[PDB]
Amino acid sequence: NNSQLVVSVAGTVEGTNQDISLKFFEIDLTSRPAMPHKLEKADLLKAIQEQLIANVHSNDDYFEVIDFASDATITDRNGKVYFADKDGSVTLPTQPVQEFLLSGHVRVRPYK
């Protein structure tokens, strides 16, 4: 169908070494009415945030997504790493239709 971003990241509680588990989903990429091929740091994070509060079980609590950890990358099947611009935007190729992966850690702080 259409290119998509496989979001497979984990959380790390700020100021600590403890990691938190986060559900991995997919984001579709298009022209414009789901996200643009030109991703926004802030958009990606809230997507992860929404998802987070939507998957809160009995054990896992509410956490606020703050930013991306230093190991976060978006890559393609050739292992190529795409880098964000001065404004935090990440522009991925429109062709061919393909898959990109967003993996790594997300800095989160507990909601309290």
Partner: protein, 249 residues
């Protein structure tokens, strides 16, 4: 015409919380004294701290590249390492001065005075022989770690608490390898690796209303890792030397 005062950023620093894994990307131009020492050709290999329009304090081993100051270029006002912002200043070094007694830090006099702006400001120096208290919160800045997608080539920062020399020298930590003319900042029995600072880069600590350059990242021993804090040259012990050199050259 008025100018900007040492140690006071015009862009509030992000102030990455302590023990954050991977540290943080700094807010552009919040560390105005952050220098990038580079070769004539334009390759970044060391960091430094602007302490005066004409002087940059860096690490002694950074001068191992060449003896001629002409081989050195200073990059000021930057955030993005590769595509330098338009206001960035590139100034060739004209003189080099190694600190005689311990030989861990060096002074670099610029061929022309840096223009002080809201993004290019010197850091303040400490009062001679001042000893930073244990637990004091400080930051190290630099382009030491190539981040992932969202921080590659961007100036990074990490907060590190200073560790009293007496403690730092214990066997399980740095085992007596730390001179009085050096100081430690890091984590014991835990923590996370902080390698953001370039050799020669700054270790600044806030005090009432300004950031004081208390340390200079030591060549090779600056990464702070659990039970092995980073080692920084203790600036307060070389303040008198610094003033004399600037006064005499």
């Amino acid at each position: 015409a008025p100018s900007f005062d040492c140690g006071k950023p015009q862009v509030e620093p992000k102030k990455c919380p302590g023990r954050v894994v991977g540290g943080c990307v700094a807010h552009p131009h919040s560390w105005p004294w952050q220098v990038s020492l580079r070769t004539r050709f334009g390759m970044h290999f060391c960091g430094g701290t602007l302490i005066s329009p004409e002087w940059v304090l860096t690490a002694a081993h950074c001068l191992e590249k060449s003896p001629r100051p002409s081989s050195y270029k200073v990059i000021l006002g930057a955030h993005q390492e590769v595509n330098l912002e338009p206001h960035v200043q590139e100034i060739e070094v004209s003189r080099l001065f190694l600190e005689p007694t311990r030989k861990d830090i060096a002074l670099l006099k610029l061929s022309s005075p840096a223009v002080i702006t809201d993004k290019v400001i010197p850091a303040c120096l400490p009062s001679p022989n001042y000893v930073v208290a244990d637990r004091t919160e400080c930051f190290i800045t630099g382009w030491g770690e190539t981040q992932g997608t969202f921080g590659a080539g961007l100036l990074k920062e990490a907060q590190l608490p200073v560790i009293e020399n007496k403690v730092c020298n214990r066997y399980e930590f740095l085992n007596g390898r730390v001179q009085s003319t050096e100081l430690c900042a890091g984590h014991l029995a835990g923590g996370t690796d902080s390698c953001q600072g370039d050799a020669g880069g700054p270790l600044v600590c806030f005090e009432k209303d300004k950031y004081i350059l208390q340390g200079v990242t030591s060549w090779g021993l600056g990464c702070a890792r659990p039970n092995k804090p980073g080692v920084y040259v203790r600036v307060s012990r070389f303040v008198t030397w610094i003033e004399g050199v600037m006064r005499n050259n």
